[PDB]
Structure formats: C-alpha cells, structure tokens
Amino acid sequence: VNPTVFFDIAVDGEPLGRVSFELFADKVPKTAENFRALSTGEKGFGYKGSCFHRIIPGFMCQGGDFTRHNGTGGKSIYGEKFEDENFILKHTGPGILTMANAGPNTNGSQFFICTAKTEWLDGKHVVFGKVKEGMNIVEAMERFGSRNGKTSKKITIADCGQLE
DSSP: OOOEEEEEEEETTEEEEEEEEEEOTTTOHHHHHHHHHHHHTTTSOOSTTOBOOEEETTTEEEEOOTTTSSSSOOOBBTBSOBOOOOOOSOOOSTTEEEEOOSSTTOBOSOEEEESSOOGGGTTTSOEEEEEEEOHHHHHHHHTTOOTTSOOSSOEEEEEEEEOO
C-alpha cells in the first residue's frame, strides 16, 4: 500500500525538521514511483542535497530541481519527461503534493508542496501525494520565502528516503 518517504530539511545548513509524505501509488502509480525513487536515490540520482529554490508564502514551496537548482533542470526516472498520468486528485488544500510542469506531458522531477488551496491547478498538474507529518516544518520553510519566490535563507533536503 501507499509509500511514505521523508525529507529532513536544513536552513543555511542547520537542521530544521522532518517532513514526511504519503505517495498515492493507489491512484498515480507511475508518478508516485518517480518521486519515491528520487527520494531514496536508488537510481543514482535524486533529491538528496537539492534545494527549494522557490517559495511563495500563502501559495507553495517548490523543489525537485536537483540538476540546476533553479527551476531550469531536473529529470524523472523515465527520461527527461513523462506524461501526465491523470488528474483524479484535486488541489484541495495545504499539504498537497503536486508536480511542476511546463506544459502538457512535461513532468520531470520538480514539485510543489502547496501551503494553500490551489484549485486553479486542477486538471493541469498531477496531484500525487500529500504531507503526512511535519506540515509545521513546511510552515517554517515557508517563512523564508518571498513575494517573488526568492528564499532569504538556503532551504535544502539534507537527507531523504523511504520510511516505508
């Protein structure tokens, strides 16, 4: 049944706390597996060490760009990009884990953790999980963001993996 993975977050190299996520493999197997594998690193590349390069309070935290650290990079475990699996799930509120993209069928490795209801993304972005514990750590991250998204401190995934 549904996998759980975690990220331990750091701020300027100082441990903050752990966020953990349920990945909805029961409804988005392919999109779930991508995130799971990136989190454990089992493919030889993944989230560990990457940063959250874009954070907008009241909206979301974005990370996943583990190759260019700035929104222009990242890749999936399938190839540069894979299809939108489906849109069964709707951005219903804070906590939601959904994929970033640059158009139809362009899912790589980037994602948003929403800090608010973002229903306008429905049918555009694949929701594939949600925060399970540490929503508060995400709320602490959120404070280092800004209106244009730039972080005032350096937010990173010091470690990540599968809890089970």
